[model samples]
Target: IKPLEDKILVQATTASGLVIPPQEGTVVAVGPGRWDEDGEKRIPLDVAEGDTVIYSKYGGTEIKYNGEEYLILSARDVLAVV
Candidate 1:
């Protein structure tokens, strides 16, 4: 699914058994970058599908569909691309 605003959809997994969130994942979908009104154009995101990224540990929501898990995050919440 296409995300809105600076949103992104990614596939991630973390060490389970404890209450911890995944901070790393591979981006699967990305939203059209937000418009930079001050710049009078769009702010294109630096990442794309298949790019591994590190985000804020608790900055996203988790979901399960068809027995698969994905994470929804904001581009701003991404700290680095691995």
Candidate 2:
């Protein structure tokens, strides 16, 4: 499914051993981006689909699809791409 606005869909990597406040995941989908200040143009997002990104642990919402879990969060939640 496609994401709207600045939201993105991510497939989180299963953690092994000790976990931190950061979570690593692969971007599954990206939104068209939010509007600019004038609301006339959309500001492009820095993150894209298929990108490996690191996000805050509690910054996203978790959901299940076909028995697999996915995370949905704003681009702002993404800290970096790895």
Candidate 3:
């Protein structure tokens, strides 16, 4: 989940462009800012658990723990918070 700033914590879903068995992708743990440095307000993300989304195939950072995969991507890296 997006927290307070612009930081988005996501769990990886699956590789892009290829069809495969259902995999557990990123899930938001926290979220960050909904405003800019100039204090301009920004739109909040529209994504949530159980909502299907599509992300950049090559964006974000990778994280692995206990055989689970996660992604820590900036809100901008997210193509659509679908």
Candidate 4:
């Protein structure tokens, strides 16, 4: 599913066949970015699809579909793109 506004979608992955840590995840989708603070146009996010990112674990919303977990959160919550 696609995310809205400044939100992003990340698919959960594992490390060494075990559940991965919450500090990072693979980007599945990204919104076009939110509106500029004092402007009328939408700002594009720095992160892109298929990139692995470090995000705030406390800020994202978790979801499950067919037993696979996903995270939906604002692109602003992303700490780094790797």
lDDT of 1 by residue, 4-77 (tens): 97888988745432343336778899997888978587788888999887777466878878887888888888
lDDT of 2 by residue, 2-74 (tens): 8889989998723543456378888999998999879999988898889988887566789989987898898
Top candidate on TM-score is: 2
RMSD of each: 4.2, 2.8, 4.9, 3.3
- Candidate with better TM-score, 1 vs 4: 4
Better of 2 and 3 by lDDT: 2
**lDDT order of candidates, top first:** 2, 4, 1, 3
> Cα lDDT of all candidates, in order?
0.79, 0.84, 0.57, 0.81
Query: For candidate 4, lDDT tens digit of each residue in 1-82?
Result: 8899889998765442434444678888998778888879999888888998878867788999998899998887888766
lDDT (C-alpha) at residue 66 in model 1: 88
Provide the lowest-lDDT 10-residue window in model 4: 13-22
User: What's the C-alpha lDDT at position 24 in model 4?
Assistant: 76
Better of 2 and 3 by TM-score: 2
> Alpha-carbon error at 27 in model 1, in Å?
0.3
Measured by TM-score, how close is model 4 to the native structure?
A: 0.78
Order of candidate numbers by TM-score, starting with the best: 2, 4, 1, 3
